């Protein structure tokens, strides 16, 4: 569980 790319 990856973070969000716009972050």
């Amino acid at each position, epitope marked *: *569980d*990856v*973070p*969000d*790319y*716009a972050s």
Partner: antibody
Amino acid sequence: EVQLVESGGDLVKPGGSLKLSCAASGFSFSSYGMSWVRQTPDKRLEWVATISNGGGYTYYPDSVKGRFTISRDNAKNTLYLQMSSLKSEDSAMYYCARRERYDENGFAYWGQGTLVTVSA
Amino acid sequence: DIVMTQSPSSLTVTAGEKVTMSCTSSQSLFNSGKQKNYLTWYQQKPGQPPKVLIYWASTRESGVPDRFTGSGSGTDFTLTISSVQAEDLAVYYCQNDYSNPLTFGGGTKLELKR
């Protein structure tokens, strides 16, 4: 076919609570993050929350920070948003939209919208 | 936050003619690593949710018609429709999709010359 159908929108007293649901289909729900994106009556579009694919990361605008919470159920294919302490500025069409974790190409998949009205 | 700006608000068009819409972020939407701008253009016709038209500023999505092209980098972006047809009278939004908070412009809304 990716299907994201929302439910829950209603008339709410300001300073109340409401909990919407977004039920996704035609994809593996858990590999993608999601967002709630709302539309006001002046057709102003704004982002509300993002939750990553395993619910371990959540993101909020200051408007909504500490008043709403995005959460998911990966087993039941359902995404949620608990609104609390509802002001009248939050009356809007609430859309669930997928975050495109693989393509990184914007909000490709949107739902139908559900409408909240916060009015005394 | 990266505030987005769209000009014009309305645009009067004649069908068959080229029309240009501009978008402006307050901060460069340029992803140095991936080497692309993370700016998306949306089209919403009434009743519908928005629709993805161009992403990565210039990459036209699948099934979107040829007449639509995205241009610009850094802070200035431009959408072109080159034979505006009658089914383009919609509202067009640009979106910062580089840094959360994600921000949407106000829209430019096409109306027809008469």
